[PDB]
Structure formats: C-alpha cells, structure tokens
Design a protein around this ligand. Structure first.
Ligand code: OXL
Ligand code: NI
Length: 494
C-alpha cells in the first residue's frame, strides 16, 4: 500500500522540458517546481504570489510590480528582481522558441528600480498580462549562460515552487519532495509522484489495485467507482471543450458549404445526453465559460436536410450508392482520434455515423496520442480550453500566424486562416476597456460561426477519482485535459 507520507497521482500528459518557457498547458509538473508572480485561488481569483502587489497606469501601458523579499529558489539562492527581468526577457527572446512567446512579445522594457520593484513597459495594452505572469519564474543565476532550449536544467529543474525535483524515470513518472522553505505555506505530504498514465482504463485499474491515489477518470468508467466506498468522486467544472478539427488543406473540407453541412449533420443534443451522460454540455464556440462569451450568437442547429441542401449547392450529387459525389470523387475523408481516449474514440464513431446518414463517407482512424502529427490529418477529434483570460486558448489556436505548418509554437493545427478572426483577436487582446474587449470577442465568435474551423461538440466536466484517505482536495474551474486539478496539491494529505 502507498505510504501515508507519499502521494501518487496519475496525469494524462507529461512534458519533456520541465521549464515554464515551454509550458503548453498540458502538464502538472511545472506548477509543482515553479511559481509565478501571480496565482489563482479556488474561485479563480487573481492573487499575489511571488509578487506582493502591483499598479497599472491609466493607459494600460506600464506595470509597477513589487516582489516578496523572503523567497528562496530550491538551491538556497534568494529570488530577486534579477530573475523576473531575466524570465520575462527569456520568454520574448525569439532565440528561445518559447511556447508562451505570444504572451510576452508585447513587452517593450523591464526596469529593475529597486531589488523588489520592476517597472514593465509595454508597446500596447495587454490586459491578459497579469494572468500571463502566473507562469513560473526562472533562475537567472543558473540559466543566464545556458541555451534555454536544450539545457540539462530542463530535466533537473530548480524553482521557487512547493515541490523540489528528485528524479525522473522517462515516460513513467517524475518524483518530487516537499519544499521545506516554501514561502507560501508548509507542504503537507513530503513525497509526491506524478505518474504518466494517458489511458484512463489503466488509471482506473491502478486506483483499484492501490498503485495510485488519484486520477481523472472518463465518465465511461465511473461505474466501477460509484459503489466503492474506498473512493470518492469529485465533479469538476471546466472550460475544456471537444470538437472536430477540420484540416483546411483537405480538398473537401476547405469548402465553406461542406464545413457548414457537416455541422448541420451532427445531433449534438443526442451526444451529450447519451454518450456523456450529462457530464457535459453542448458546445458551439470556444469561450462559453468566459466573461468574453457574447451569449447571443448564431448556431448550427441539427438539420440533416439543410446539410444535404448545402452539399447539393456545393455541386455534389448522391451517386447510386447514396454517397455525395462531385466530378467523379465521393465526398470522403478521415477522422482521427486519440485511441487512448475512449471519449474521443466514441465521438469519432458517432460523427462517422452522423455523416453516413447524409451520404458523406468517412473512415475512423484511432492511434495513440503523440504517435502521429495532428496537423497532417484530414480531421481530428481535438480539444482546448482555459479558465484564464480568453486570449490564452484562442490566439495560438485560431490566429493565422499560429498556423503550425509555419510556426513551430503555433496551435492552429487545422491551418485555419480568417481575416475577421485575426482582426478580432488582435484588437481584443490589446484593448484595456472590458466592454470593448467583449465587443471584439463577439466579433470573433460571430466570425467563427460564419467560417467555422471546427464542429464544436461539448464542454466537459471532469471526474476526479480519489482514494478516500485523501484529505484537503479543493475544486476549481479546470482547463483543457482537466489541468489544474492538482492546483492545491500542497494542501493534500493522508
Ligand atoms: O491539445 C490538443 O491538441 C488536444 O488535446 O486535442
Ligand atoms: Ni490537448
């Protein structure tokens, strides 16, 4: 049995470089080792962390940030303004190829005015900046002469976070020990292990045979825990959605009428009702848990007749087999799903069924996450979503310059290029006035409807399943893959 002083938590995704500069919002380990200037509480409220306070100028261009003087890095060295300037400059240096480059490109200058005071000046307003500064700070004294891209640091990280790095068995687990000088509070469980388990049926089994203490578990597997008193189940809300990603390079899917038709073809109400057992709600756009949600937008209602009318209009005709065809080619394409994710496999199956009903042929291809290039398939059962500022999973996902065929750190895997979307997100992220921001996000949402990059399917709840001995777990609004479910792990204990 797992000792009382050890926490073992399963997490779906890992990261090859435990370094805030390469955060892709998929891991649970950078936030153990590192901490940022700001943080969020159970209500997703912005709170001071490494920074004690801050003032922003009326024009939104200047940030005066005041730091704690009582923080140590894991190696004993004090945390100073030196680190903060090194870090922010590090994220916006193009030679570092940072995954969060777009969160810091707008910084013009970082001035250290006293050892606990930095003055950050921006080219244009970027209200998302304080959310952005929740990213971990890096240690200047260890990395200032390093190649941030390849440094051995990335596999031996030193941070200011609640947990010190111990060892790493690649592909299997990372092991940590409590930071006994953690400025924020005392870490309760001295030993913590994050186990890499990307298939929930395997996670489920390891809960049952006592190999792990906690995991997020797909709704399809919850039945074997609902009547087991040895476990609790915490339902967590999230901003995470699932969708069909259209690859716009595909000869059929590039066509606006075809993409609209495929949207009209899917009975989303039936999916959420039946597959997801109301651990989900129907999705239509990517900001429906945001303040940025326009709440009055157009949608593609389930309408098979309209789908067919659209495909006729696009020049297709049902052949003798009942399949839409144009110029000797039937309208067909592949739908790819992560085979280790039962929800996505089920969804790819349902889409294939829905399309078949209107004479669209498709092939489901299920392969393990990480084993194929998601930007090189006709379509992909994709997911994104962040409870933080609406910029964070929209700019890298939809904007043209973030097309991943051009931008190694872009998340626009479908190669989507829309002028109204580009303009809307750019204005939205660089305007200070909240009401103005909402206006631009409405333009963005409306533009997405007119030129849909996806079929949006559903927003997910997550089920945190945990050994009943576990105390201290707090919920909050999770992100994509349920990331964030370990946000207060330093308060957890047995
Ligand atoms: O992050 C993604 O690409 C996903 O999970 O679909
Ligand atoms: Ni993902």
């Amino acid at each position: 049995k797992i000792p009382k002083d050890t926490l073992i938590i399963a997490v779906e995704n890992e990261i090859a470089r435990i370094n805030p500069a390469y955060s892709e919002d998929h891991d649970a380990v950078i936030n153990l080792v590192f901490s940022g200037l700001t943080r969020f509480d159970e209500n997703m409220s912005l709170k001071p962390d490494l920074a004690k306070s801050w003032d922003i100028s009326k024009d939104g261009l200047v940030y005066d940030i005041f730091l704690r003087d009582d923080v140590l890095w894991h190696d004993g060295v004090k945390f100073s303004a030196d680190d903060v300037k090194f870090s922010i400059e590090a994220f916006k240096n193009p030679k570092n190829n940072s995954s969060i480059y777009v969160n810091f490109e707008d910084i013009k200058s970082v001035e250290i005015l006293n050892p606990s005071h930095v003055k950050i000046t921006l080219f244009k307003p970027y209200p998302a900046f304080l959310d952005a500064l929740s990213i971990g700070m890096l240690p200047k004294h260890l990395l200032e002469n390093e190649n941030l891209n390849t440094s051995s640091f990335n596999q031996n990280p030193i941070g200011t976070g609640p947990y010190k790095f111990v060892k790493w068995k690649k592909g299997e687990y990372v092991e940590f020990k409590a930071n006994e000088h953690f400025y924020l509070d005392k870490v309760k469980t001295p030993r913590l292990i994050i186990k890499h388990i990307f298939d929930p049926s395997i996670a489920s089994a390891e809960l049952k045979n006592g190999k792990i203490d906690a995991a997020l578990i797909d709704v399809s597997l919850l039945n074997i825990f609902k009547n087991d008193e040895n476990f609790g189940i915490l339902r967590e809300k999230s901003a995470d959605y699932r969708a069909l990603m259209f690859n716009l390079d595909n000869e059929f899917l590039k066509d606006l009428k075809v993409r609209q038709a495929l949207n009209y073809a899917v009975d989303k109400e039936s999916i959420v009702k039946n597959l997801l057992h109301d651990y989900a709600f129907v999705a239509n756009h990517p900001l429906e848990r945001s303040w940025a949600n326009s709440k009055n937008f157009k949608i593609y209602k389930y309408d098979p007749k309209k789908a067919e009318d659209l495909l006729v209009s696009a020049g297709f005709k049902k052949n003798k087999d009942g399949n839409f065809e144009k110029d000797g080619k039937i309208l067909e394409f592949e739908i790819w799903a992560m085979s280790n994710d039962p929800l996505r496999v089920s969804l790819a199956g349902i889409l294939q069924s829905e399309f078949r009903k209107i004479g669209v042929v498709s092939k489901v291809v299920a392969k393990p996450a990480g084993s194929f290039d998601y930007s090189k398939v006709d379509s992909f059962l994709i997911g994104w979503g962040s409870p933080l500022d609406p910029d964070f999973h929209t700019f890298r996902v939809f904007e043209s310059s973030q097309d991943s065929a051009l931008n190694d750190e872009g998340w626009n895997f479908g190669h989507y290029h829309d002028k109204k979307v580009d303009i809307a997100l750019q204005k939205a992220r660089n305007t200070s006035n909240l009401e103005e921001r909402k206006k631009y996000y409405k333009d963005f949402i409306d533009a997405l409807y007119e030129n849909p990059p996806f079929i949006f399917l559903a927003y997910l709840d997550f089920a945190l399943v945990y050994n009943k001995d576990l105390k201290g777990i707090k919920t909050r609004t999770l992100g994509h893959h349920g990331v964030g479910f370990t946000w207060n792990v330093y308060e957890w204990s047995k």
